[PDB]
Amino acid sequence: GMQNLKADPEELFTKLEKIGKGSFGEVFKGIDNRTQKVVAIKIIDLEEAEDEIEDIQQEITVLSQCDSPYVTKYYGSYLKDTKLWIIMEYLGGGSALDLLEPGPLDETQIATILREILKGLDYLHSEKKIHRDIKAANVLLSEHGEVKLADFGVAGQLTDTQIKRNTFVGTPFWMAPEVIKQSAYDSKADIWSLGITAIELARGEPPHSELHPMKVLFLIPKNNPPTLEGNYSKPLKEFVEACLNKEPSFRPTAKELLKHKFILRNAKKTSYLTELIDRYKRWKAEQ
């Protein structure tokens, strides 16, 4: 699966300053010397880790197979010394979680972001891929409001001989009950995580956010599903309820949710999200 691994990355890319901790390794800003576009370079010390190597292999494989404006564009993977360079487009607006830091979102912003996440999920699920770590931190925005899915290190792939997955992966607050129970599951697991992400975008945090992650591992399969509480519109509450069904076959598909009243009534053009990005830039500058 490493068939298209490249060599000598610094002949095509310039590595610039560090921009953050990656799901694996550290991520640096960089320049594509061929276009002068800015890229993100995830650098992984293959020597330091080895248990994670399978997850690193999976991230590259999944990224290399995606071609969508709703999934972080993949440039390639490059070997240098003991380091692996995973190169992707740089998105200048930060994550949806970042954008929540200064204050609450309104329902137009929530709907716009959810609509784009849904387009990303529709793409992935049509490719028989399951993201398995949907949450605001893995939703990235361009500086002008485009919304893309990121961090495919625990993504799953269905095939003709593997029609379900059963791996225990994800982030506990966002995990579907059937994933926690390690039942056979599919793309409907992402739809549950989308429901939790909708609560996260509305309330600023997922249900059970104050609890130790191990505690929520028993609470989620046991308890009734979360609902969105507070003075939110009925269609937003219904959107969340639709996603957060304990029985996965009763959850809608991403395509179906793109037609939900909440999305149709409230989603607007993505360029309006620049206001959110500007709010974050102002907020960050005085922290």
Among residues 98, 122, 133, 190, the one annotated as catalytic is: 133
Decide whether 71 or 176 has the Cβ nearer to ligand SKE.
Answer: 71
Provide the mask over 9-48, with x wherever binding to ligand SKE is found by CB under 6 A and - wherever it is not. ----------xx-x----x------------x--------
Task: List C-alpha distances in Å: 155 to 150, 167, 171, 194.
Answer: 10, 10, 12, 15
CB 23 to ligand SKE: min, Å: 6
Using the rule CB under 6 A, is 145 a contact of ligand SKE?
no
Using the rule CB under 5 A, is 151 a contact of Mg ion?
yes
Question: What is the phi/psi pair of residue 280, to 5°?
Answer: -65, -45
- Torsion region of 81: left, alpha or beta (phi above 0 gives left; psi -120 to 50 gives alpha): left
Applying CB under 6 A, which part among 84-92, 119-127, 200-208, 233-241 lies near ligand SKE?
84-92
Of 204, 243, 210, give the one whose Cα is nearest residue 226.
Answer: 243
Among 105, 134, 150, 277, binds ligand SKE (CB under 6 A): 150
Of 127, 216, 158, give the one whose Cα is nearest residue 166.
Answer: 158
Residue nearest to ligand SKE (CB): 94
Residues facing residue 18 across a β-bridge = 28
Provide the mask over 95-134, with x wherever binding to ligand SKE is found by CB under 6 A and - wherever it is not. ---x------------------------------------
Q: Is the dihedral of CA 225, 220, 170, 97 positive or negative?
A: positive
133 included as an active-site residue: yes
The reply, when asked if residue 20 is annotated as ligand binding, is yes
Amino acid at position 5, single letter: L
**Contacts by residues 281-287 (CB-CB < 8 Å, ≥ 24 positions apart):** 282/102, 283/101, 283/102, 284/101
Of 70, 94, 95, give the one whose Cα is nearest residue 254.
Answer: 70
Number of residues located near Mg ion, criterion CB under 5 A: 3
Site for ligand SKE, rule CB under 6 A: 19-20, 22, 27, 40, 72, 88-92, 94, 98, 140, 150-151
Site for Mg ion, rule CB under 5 A: 23, 138, 151
Catalytic residues: 133
